[PDB]
Amino acid sequence: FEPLDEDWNEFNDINKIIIRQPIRTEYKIAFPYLYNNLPHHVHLTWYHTPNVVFIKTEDPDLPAFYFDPLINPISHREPLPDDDEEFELPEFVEPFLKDTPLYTDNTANGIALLWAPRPFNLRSGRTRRALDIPLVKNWYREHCPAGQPVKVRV
Amino acid sequence: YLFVFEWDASEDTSIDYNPLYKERHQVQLLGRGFIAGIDLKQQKREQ
Amino acid sequence: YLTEHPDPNNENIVGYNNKKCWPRDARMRLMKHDVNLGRAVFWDIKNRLPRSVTTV
Amino acid sequence: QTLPVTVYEMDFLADLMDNSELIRNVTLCGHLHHGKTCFVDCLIEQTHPEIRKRYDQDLCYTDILFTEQERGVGIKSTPVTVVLPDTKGKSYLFNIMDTPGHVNFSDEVTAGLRISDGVVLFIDAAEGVMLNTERLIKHAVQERLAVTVCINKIDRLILELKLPPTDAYYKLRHIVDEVNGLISMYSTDENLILSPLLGNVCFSSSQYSICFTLGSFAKIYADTFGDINYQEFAKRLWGDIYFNPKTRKFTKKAPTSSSQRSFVEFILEPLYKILAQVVGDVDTSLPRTLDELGIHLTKEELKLNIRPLLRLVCKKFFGEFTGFVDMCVQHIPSPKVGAKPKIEHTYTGGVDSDLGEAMSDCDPDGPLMCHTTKMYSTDDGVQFHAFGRVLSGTIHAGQPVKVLGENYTLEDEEDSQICTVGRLWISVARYHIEVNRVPAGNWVLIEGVDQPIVKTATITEPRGNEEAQIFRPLKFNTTSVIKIAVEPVNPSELPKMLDGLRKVNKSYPSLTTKVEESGEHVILGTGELYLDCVMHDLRKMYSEIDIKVADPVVTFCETVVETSSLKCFAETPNKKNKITMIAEPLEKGLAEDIENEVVQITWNRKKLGEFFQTKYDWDLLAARSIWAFGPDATGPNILVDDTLPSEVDKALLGSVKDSIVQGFQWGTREGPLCDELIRNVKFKILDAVVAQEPLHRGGGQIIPTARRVVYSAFLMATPRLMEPYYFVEVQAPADCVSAVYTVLARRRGHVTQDAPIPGSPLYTIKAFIPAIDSFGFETDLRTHTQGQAFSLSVFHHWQIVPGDPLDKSIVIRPLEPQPAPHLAREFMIKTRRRKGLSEDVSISKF
Amino acid sequence: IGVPIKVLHEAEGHIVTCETNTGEVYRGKLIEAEDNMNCQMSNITVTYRDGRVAQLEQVYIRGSKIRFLILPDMLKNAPMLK
Ligand SMILES: Nc1nc2c(ncn2[C@@H]2O[C@H](COP(=O)(O)OP(=O)(O)OP(=O)(O)O)[C@@H](O)[C@H]2O)c(=O)[nH]1
Numbered sequence A: 001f002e003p004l005d006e007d008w009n010e011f012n013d014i015n016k017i018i019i020r021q022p023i024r025t026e027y028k029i030a031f032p033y034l035y036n037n038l039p040h041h042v043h044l045t046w047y048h049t050p051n052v053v054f055i056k057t058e059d060p061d062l063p064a065f066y067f068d069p070l071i072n073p074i075s076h077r078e079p080l081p082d083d084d085e086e087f088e089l090p091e092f093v094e095p096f097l098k099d100t101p102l103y104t105d106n107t108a109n110g111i112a113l114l115w116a117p118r119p120f121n122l123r124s125g126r127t128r129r130a131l132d133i134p135l136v137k138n139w140y141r142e143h144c145p146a147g148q149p150v151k152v153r154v
Numbered sequence B: 001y002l003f004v005f006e007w008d009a010s011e012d013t014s015i016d017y018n019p020l021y022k023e024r025h026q027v028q029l030l031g032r033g034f035i036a037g038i039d040l041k042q043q044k045r046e047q
Numbered sequence C: 001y002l003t004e005h006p007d008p009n010n011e012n013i014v015g016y017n018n019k020k021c022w023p024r025d026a027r028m029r030l031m032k033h034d035v036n037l038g039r040a041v042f043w044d045i046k047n048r049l050p051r052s053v054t055t056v
Numbered sequence D: 001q002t003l004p005v006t007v008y009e010m011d012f013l014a015d016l017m018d019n020s021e022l023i024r025n026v027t028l029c030g031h032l033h034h035g036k037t038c039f040v041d042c043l044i045e046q047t048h049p050e051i052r053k054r055y056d057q058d059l060c061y062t063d064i065l066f067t068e069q070e071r072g073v074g075i076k077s078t079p080v081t082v083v084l085p086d087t088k089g090k091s092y093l094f095n096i097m098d099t100p101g102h103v104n105f106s107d108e109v110t111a112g113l114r115i116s117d118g119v120v121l122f123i124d125a126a127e128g129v130m131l132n133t134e135r136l137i138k139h140a141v142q143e144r145l146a147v148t149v150c151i152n153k154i155d156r157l158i159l160e161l162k163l164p165p166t167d168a169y170y171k172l173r174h175i176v177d178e179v180n181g182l183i184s185m186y187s188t189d190e191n192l193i194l195s196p197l198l199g200n201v202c203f204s205s206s207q208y209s210i211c212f213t214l215g216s217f218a219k220i221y222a223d224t225f226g227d228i229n230y231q232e233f234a235k236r237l238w239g240d241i242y243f244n245p246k247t248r249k250f251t252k253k254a255p256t257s258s259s260q261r262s263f264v265e266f267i268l269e270p271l272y273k274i275l276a277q278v279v280g281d282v283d284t285s286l287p288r289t290l291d292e293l294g295i296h297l298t299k300e301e302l303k304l305n306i307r308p309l310l311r312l313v314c315k316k317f318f319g320e321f322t323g324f325v326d327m328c329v330q331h332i333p334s335p336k337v338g339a340k341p342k343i344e345h346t347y348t349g350g351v352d353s354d355l356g357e358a359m360s361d362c363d364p365d366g367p368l369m370c371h372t373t374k375m376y377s378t379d380d381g382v383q384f385h386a387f388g389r390v391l392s393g394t395i396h397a398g399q400p401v402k403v404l405g406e407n408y409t410l411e412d413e414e415d416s417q418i419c420t421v422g423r424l425w426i427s428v429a430r431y432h433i434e435v436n437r438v439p440a441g442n443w444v445l446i447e448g449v450d451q452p453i454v455k456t457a458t459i460t461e462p463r464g465n466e467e468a469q470i471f472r473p474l475k476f477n478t479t480s481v482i483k484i485a486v487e488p489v490n491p492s493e494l495p496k497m498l499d500g501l502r503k504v505n506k507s508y509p510s511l512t513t514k515v516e517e518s519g520e521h522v523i524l525g526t527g528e529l530y531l532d533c534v535m536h537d538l539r540k541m542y543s544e545i546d547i548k549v550a551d552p553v554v555t556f557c558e559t560v561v562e563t564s565s566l567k568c569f570a571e572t573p574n575k576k577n578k579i580t581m582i583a584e585p586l587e588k589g590l591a592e593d594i595e596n597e598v599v600q601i602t603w604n605r606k607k608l609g610e611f612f613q614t615k616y617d618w619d620l621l622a623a624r625s626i627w628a629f630g631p632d633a634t635g636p637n638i639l640v641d642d643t644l645p646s647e648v649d650k651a652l653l654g655s656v657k658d659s660i661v662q663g664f665q666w667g668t669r670e671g672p673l674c675d676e677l678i679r680n681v682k683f684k685i686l687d688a689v690v691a692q693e694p695l696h697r698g699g700g701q702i703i704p705t706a707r708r709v710v711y712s713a714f715l716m717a718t719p720r721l722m723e724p725y726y727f728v729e730v731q732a733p734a735d736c737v738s739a740v741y742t743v744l745a746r747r748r749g750h751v752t753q754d755a756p757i758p759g760s761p762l763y764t765i766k767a768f769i770p771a772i773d774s775f776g777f778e779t780d781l782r783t784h785t786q787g788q789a790f791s792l793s794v795f796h797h798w799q800i801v802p803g804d805p806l807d808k809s810i811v812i813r814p815l816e817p818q819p820a821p822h823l824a825r826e827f828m829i830k831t832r833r834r835k836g837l838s839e840d841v842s843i844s845k846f
Numbered sequence E: 001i002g003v004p005i006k007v008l009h010e011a012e013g014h015i016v017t018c019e020t021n022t023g024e025v026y027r028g029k030l031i032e033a034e035d036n037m038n039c040q041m042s043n044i045t046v047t048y049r050d051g052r053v054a055q056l057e058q059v060y061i062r063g064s065k066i067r068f069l070i071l072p073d074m075l076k077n078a079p080m081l082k
């Protein structure tokens, strides 16, 4: 972008400054008030989002809830009362929803659509006129791929 | 501490002589995620 | 100099004429002793001239 | 006054404060972003009908700052006062403090644990135990509070990992076992075993409003089917216990090979089936599932998206959050019962005094004793409000009060003032309820006492209460090492900044502002984001001017390695009395035993000496002759006597040592290298010629003399410098770990531990780094690893800088990163140049 | 369950005074109460029919013999009664 000459003081003495690692521009951008003189119209960015650990399913014949071995194995090894004080439930007591199965055919697809981009994570909405839907916006919005020429980066 | 229809090469950014930033070490995302549009067999070859 | 004209906040740094055509390692470095000495020199020269006769 | 619509009357909350048994003072804490403020949002939605979450955004009802909204992280600990019902239906009054989970704001937790009795630790079920959780378990045990653990984000075990049920049970059991291990490491109490059978561990998911213990879900069974003792049924839903459908019993042996555990069979799999039928089968089999569970919805409610519909189904199913209330009542004491260890721990002068016995009963009338720790700003920033708890008596609006500071003693009576209480509030997050009286046991917001308060204060009565002493200051969990220098842009606007510099010193507990001898204004901090918030709040709220900030540097310290070659003797300028010393370094690990209060002065010379002669194998002539440690509060520098009684009369020596200890305490700070403090040294007095006349034994002769003796003994025994080292934990995917090893290779660091997280595809990297190299480290990782790896860093220890700080033969080229032998000389010369000393110091200077 | 039992559990921890069928008045802090009126109370001032005042520190009253209880006055703003 186009832009929107300092004397030697007691304050900017380079004999007082320890030069160990070079300070860059992204240090000024991530922390706008620590390393910046005259920080006029900066905006405070988002800090951090927790790591979404969603793992994609490649085989439809596998069950929807499965120990996918990208997950690391858990290492294996309390006031438990005795069996003599016999607690007995009434006969009509059941666990909840025992007739329904644990997973169906639409379970893994329903979980995979929960982490879909807009509007594929939705199930209802309004229509949009066809010239207001960019199809290229993510592609130049993400980053530049490696090995591209100069003019494509520009 | 102290007309031209093309774009010129002097307008370029990311000309930085850093070992961390030239090789930015892109992600592959658990061997499951894919970069969109670039060919999937070619992405499985360059992993 | 600091007897008649004290400086509690070191304000004689702001307003010091300095050569901008040279780089910063080339032009005058504004250390506090040197700025106070220059203010003292110019005041001692200014005291010798009556302002009704001539003025610096 | 105007107030939002609340499910209970405010006169009920006004009348409920007068009973000190029905109150709980609870601090919620945990690691960064493990679901604290969202659980507080769920509690506010439970207590308020007109406050609801947006469909796309988090509420953050207790995040009221603009920085807390723009950054997305918690900054300041915020209180709230609510009334909640338990399982059986009894109303309780909760004072809940939301503390920020970031490590650099750990000082915001220490100010929160001074005025509370119980700790609720939130732990992510996906990530498990992290750095700040491990630090807060230690900080909650060492402050002597009861600890309960709530496991948040169990839906990530459902919708993200897609994990089998008994493996998720194994994950939860591993998390609880790690909590029990971290408790048993620090606690001496063997009765602190955490288990869900005791009602001590609660399970929760904050995003979809899920919260249950064993007892609440057993109460759900008792409300669904009936005729079930739910308190007995909840005693057998954890561990290796099995439901046998033949005899209808709970047996520890396997009925079949495919028999699941009772926690999987009764609790966890119905949760999986509810989430599965809501998410995957909303169109086909959801009305049958909702008709079986007994939940009816509107047709307009059935057209919502997946996440608000799942939150609505879990909210209509589980209902009110009674298990959290049951846990915080069963395992956290009332302020009447739990007052005695609080007075024993925090009140100076002991519990055995007259005022300690009066505060030990939480008497709502009598001596008014209050302890204020937090200072809040207004919307205008021109005045502050004090915030604390009422230990004894009832505080009133308009009453004259006596504010006592941290420098107050009964001998001095200097740090005290008489002020007038303007208003009194009880604090909710986004509004404040004004009252005219607050009894004992509650929290209180006081207007009109903010002028003598710096960090903490004690509120007493003006007339009577003559033996009132102050409470202890806040003992923080870390030490701020980052130095930054500030100046104003216009030098004429210097008294404006000096206004704001003493205002941000009030709202920030661990902030340290000072003025150097060269005129530089130095602020101490613990990290980058901390001083970023310091600069934001400072400028935008207290300065409205432009402020120049210098390059950040870390705080250095001084030490020795060898024993001095020659005895160091010096006389007073009265030329009658001489002091001679040899300086030596301490053994490995004793400094930390001083710092962590294992070794203590004030002891009556027996157990003290037996510790030295038992563990570190000190002689009896050496253990019985130690006198003092550090500058000020017990710094790890030690005064030792070696004067034999055959040559030096100890009855005359015992009169001058009251001046020697002042000499040492004032000489062990601002040492001769670069005016800093000492680390890991002992100071051994060998010869002493003591004056006979009392006028030659003045302190003005001998205290700068002993200062010069200290300085000579330090300069002769090969002096070195020490720098702070940070502990770093890196959370990264399976391939970015090598990139982390690549990045840490250039900042003089080393990786100590690389451990796979059980139950998660992420790894943990535990390493050490120099704090002077840790500027921009997080940005380097989050740029080189595409933002995937995340890292947090805390202060850990001190180590010796390589190089000679006295080698004048080394020439230093400016503006260049110097290699390893040049480091100590560069650091020492540049700190002397910055602080304003001479360009060198000599061996024969003192 | 009914409304007065929720009010009885609401008054736990406070000082109530109960009169039973034997004409004896027991005043003190209510510790525990159940669905039925079995009341565990502590620090009890005891008034008999003739007028003797006693100090009994732990009392457990069966709910069958109770005429009535007397509750604190600030329960009119309790949520179940509104
Ligand atoms: N999956 C899931 N995410 C959650 C849950 N609870 C909170 N989160 C999300 O995690 C992120 C952080 O939640 P916060 O409550 O802001 O985290 P925090 O603990 O307040 O962080 P601090 O500011 O350190 O207190 C937000 O996006 C939340 O929506 C939960 O139960 N499940």
Ligand SMILES: [Mg+2]
Residues within 6 Å of the ligand: D033, D036, D037, D073, D074, D100, D101
């Ligand atoms: Mg938070």
